[PDB]
Write a protein that binds this ligand. Structure first.
Ligand SMILES: COc1ncnc(NCc2ccc(S(N)(=O)=O)cc2)c1[N+](=O)[O-]
Ligand SMILES: [Zn+2]
Length: 257
C-alpha cells in the first residue's frame, strides 16, 4: 500500500488519493516574511492538564500515542479556531539524518523532525466524522531540532523498542504532552490537509514558531523503528515525511511580530 519509498512514496500518492493534487494540501513551506501578522488572532489555548494517554502504536508509518478523547480532557481552542478540539493522538515525522525530517519547512529550512498533536472538532462528535469536514481537525505542529534533550520526550523514547515493527502496540498511560511544548505559543496558521493518505482537506494547521530541542540520542531511537512487520525484511522507519506542497491560493497568518 502507500508508504514512503521510491515505489509507494509521496510522489505516488495521488494515484490512490487524487486530492494529493488538491487546492489545500499540506505540508507547506512557511515563508516567514510573507506570512501576514494578524493582531486579531487569539492566543492559542492548550488545555492538556487532564490528558489521558492510553497506548502507543507502530502503525507502519509512524508511531502514535493515543489519548482517551471521549470527554473534554485535553483540548485545543482559541488561536484561530472557533469552537473546541479534543486531542486524539500525537505522532512524529523524522528523517534519516538530522538535516531533514520535518514536513513543514520555515524559509526552506527542514528540521530534524516534526511533532503533530492532532485534535478534532467537538461539534462533529468523533474523529471519523470530523475528518470528512473542512473544519474537522486542528493539528498543532512543533518542529524538533537536535541539541539538548527534551526530558518530557524520554518516556516516549524508552518504550519504542517494545513497538519496533508494524502493528505492535503497548499500553502507554500517564504521558503528559505538555512536556513536548516549547516555551512560546506564537504560531503560524493556514488551512490544509492530512499529510498522509487519505490526505483529506480537513485540517486547520497551527505551527509553533519555536522548535523544541531533542538530543541526537532521542531522535536516533526514532530511527531504530521499522516500517515492516515482525518477520518481513527490515526497513528502518526514517524519512516518513511528505515534502512541501504548493501553497496555491492560501495565506499563512502569524500570531506574532
Ligand atoms: C479514529 O482513528 C483514526 N482514524 C483514521 N485516521 C486517523 N489519523 C489519520 C491522520 C493522518 C495524518 C495526520 S497529520 N500527518 O496530518 O497530522 C493526522 C491524522 C485516526 N487517528 O489516528 O486519530
Ligand atoms: Zn503528521
Amino acid at each position: 500500500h502507500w508508504g514512503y519509498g521510491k515505489h509507494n512514496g509521496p510522489e505516488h500518492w495521488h494515484k490512490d488519493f487524487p486530492i494529493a493534487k488538491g487546492e489545500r494540501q499540506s505540508p507547506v513551506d512557511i515563508d516567514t516574511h510573507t506570512a501576514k501578522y494578524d493582531p486579531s488572532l487569539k492566543p492559542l489555548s492548550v488545555s492538556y492538564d487532564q490528558a489521558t494517554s492510553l497506548r502507543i502504536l507502530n502503525n507502519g508509518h509512524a508511531f502514535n500515542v493515543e489519548f482517551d478523547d471521549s470527554q473534554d480532557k485535553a483540548v485545543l481552542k482559541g488561536g484561530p479556531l472557533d469552537g473546541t478540539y479534543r486531542l486524539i493522538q500525537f505522532h512524529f515525522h523524522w528523517g534519516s539524518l538530522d538535516g531533514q525530517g520535518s514536513e513543514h519547512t520555515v524559509d526552506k529550512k527542514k528540521y530534524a523532525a516534526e511533532l503533530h498533536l492532532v485534535h478534532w472538532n467537538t461539534k462533529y462528535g468523533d474523529f471519523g466524522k470530523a475528518v470528512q469536514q473542512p473544519d474537522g481537525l486542528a493539528v498543532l505542529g512543533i518542529f524538533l531540532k537536535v541539541g539538548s534533550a527534551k526530558p518530557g520526550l524520554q518516556k516516549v523514547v524508552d518504550v519504542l523498542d517494545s513497538i519496533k515493527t508494524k502493528g505492535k502496540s503497548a499500553d502507554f498511560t500517564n504521558f503528559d504532552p505538555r512536556g513536548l511544548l516549547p516555551e512560546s505559543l506564537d504560531y503560524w496558521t493556514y488551512p490544509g490537509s492530512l499529510t498522509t493518505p487519505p490526505l483529506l482537506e480537513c485540517v486547520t494547521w497551527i505551527v509553533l514558531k519555536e522548535p523544541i530541542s531533542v538530543s541526537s540520542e532521542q531522535v536516533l531511537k526514532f530511527r531504530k523503528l521499522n516500517f515492516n512487520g515482525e518477520g518481513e525484511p527490515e526497513e528502518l522507519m526514517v524519512d516518513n515525511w511528505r515534502p512541501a506542497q504548493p501553497l496555491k491560493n492560501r495565506q499563512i497568518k502569524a500570531s506574532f511580530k
